[PDB]
Amino acid sequence: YPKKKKARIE
Amino acid sequence: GTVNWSVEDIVKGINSNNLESQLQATQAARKLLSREKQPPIDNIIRAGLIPKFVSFLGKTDCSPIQFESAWALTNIASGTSEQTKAVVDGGAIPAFISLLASPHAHISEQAVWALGNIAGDGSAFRDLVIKHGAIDPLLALLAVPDLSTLACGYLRNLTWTLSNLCRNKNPAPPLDAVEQILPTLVRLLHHNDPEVLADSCWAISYLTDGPNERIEMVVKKGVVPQLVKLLGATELPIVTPALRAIGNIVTGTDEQTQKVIDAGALAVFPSLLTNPKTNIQKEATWTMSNITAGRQDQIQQVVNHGLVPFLVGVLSKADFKTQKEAAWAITNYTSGGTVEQIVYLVHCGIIEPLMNLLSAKDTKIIQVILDAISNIFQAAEKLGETEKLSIMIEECGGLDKIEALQRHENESVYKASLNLIEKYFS
């Protein structure tokens, strides 16, 4: 399965 | 300016009685938490900053601090279950749901993102987000005449958060929530953006992974033809979830598998069963196995599409897991098929690869292969072909492998091999 969570990266 | 602050200075600024100093410190915290290389989530939590960020979420007259705190809390909630729990314990769920209605698009997008992380933690936080009433405003954000007018990243984040609201089991999402979400999912499934399509297919795959009643909830909306179309897509991130959804659907009742067949899915399997990506081949063979376990007319449709030679090919050469799936498909075929269909199976050359696969150490695949051979021998008996099949098995080295299986740990392998020898090789 794909990522459960993701951070907003800059 | 706000680059490379220490958490000490961030705390000093947030603890000041100056809203602008608080905003500067919150932006510094956001910039700390938005780096790939080990963002200091635990240090920010230990400093006791979550309550201050949650309070800032509700400062309507200062939208920048709302945005910065939302970004920081999003990145904190993107970590381990304990960090997401720290975010939730601060009361962030209702604050983010309130921000969903913000007049500023970027703030509402960030709230969507944070809620997506929170819900993606797992079943409990998913159902808690739902209980706080996020589905209504989330879906309202998508209630427009044409999705194309929405910003691309905004729509992608909305789709991803919705897919997380559809994700996870034990328990699965509430039935009423799934019914509330499904129409917007069907609409997103016809959107043109690859990411939106991929996440919508992933949501559908989540929703179809369960009892036949959930599969029915999804199938009634008429998405199967669109799922097949996407199965034919060129983007692997789209084909993978579409294939997963189709497989989950064919694990249901024979009528749902027939709905999949009528949409024209089988015509795509010549390529899927030769796809250069291992996982695509594996899941396509698993889908085929769950299709061959159906009715005899469905096995006949599998035959008419010329997919038996492709099953033979996968059984002859493929990654071992795909070969397991092929063995299962063949055993289901032989257990549910007519005599003519099993004879055709033999005529396509299944015997030699099926025998070659008996040398693998996996015990369960050996049991499966022996069951398939027993079914084929029954079909031959019905026609008087027992000896011809026995000779074929002897010529390719299968008899040696069966005789060796006679002395095997597993009781069922033991007994089935001995019985084959006793009944068909005198």
Q: Are B243 and B258 in contact (CB under 8 A)?
A: no
What b-and-e string marks burial along B190-225, b requiring 16 or more CB atoms within 10 Å of the CB? ebebebbbbbbbbbbbbbbbbeeebbebbbeeebbe
Neighbours of B235 (CB within 10 A): 13
Inter-chain CB proximity A7 and B78 less than 8 Å: yes
Range of the domain at B389: 1-426
Please give the backbone phi and psi of residue B15, each rounded to the nearest 5 degrees, phi first.
-80, -10
B39 and A7 in contact by Cβ < 8 A?
yes
> What is the structure's resolution, reported in angstroms to one decimal?
2.3
Structure tokens at B19: 């809203």
Q: Is B164 on the interface with A (CB under 8 A)?
A: yes
CA-derived radius of gyration, chain A: 8
How far apart, in whole angstroms, are the C-alpha atoms of residue B153 and residue B382?
A: 62
Dihedral sign from CA coordinates of A8, B2, B6, B12: negative
Q: Give dist(CA B381, CA B389) in Å, integer.
A: 10
Sequence-distant (6+) residues with CB within 8 A of B396 are B351, B352, B355, B356
Q: Which stretches of B59-150 are DSSP H helices?
A: 63-77, 81-89, 92-99, 105-121, 123-131, 135-141
Per the CB < 8 Å rule, is B74 touching A8?
Answer: yes
- Opening angle at CA B257, ends B254 and B260, nearest 5: 155
CA distance A4 to chain B (A): 5
- Start-to-end C-alpha separation, chain B: 89
Helices (H) and strands (E) in chain A, counts: 0, 0
How many domains, chain B?
1
Neighbours of B414 (CB within 10 A): 14
Burial of B348 (0-12, 13-18, 19+ CB in 10 A): middle
| Sign of the alpha-carbon torsion through B219, B243, B187, B107 | positive
Structure tokens at B64: 């920048």
Per the CB < 8 A criterion, the answer to whether B293 and B254 are in contact is: no
Experimental method: X-ray
Report how far residue B401's alpha carbon sits from residue B235's, in angstroms, rounded to the nearest whole number. Answer: 42
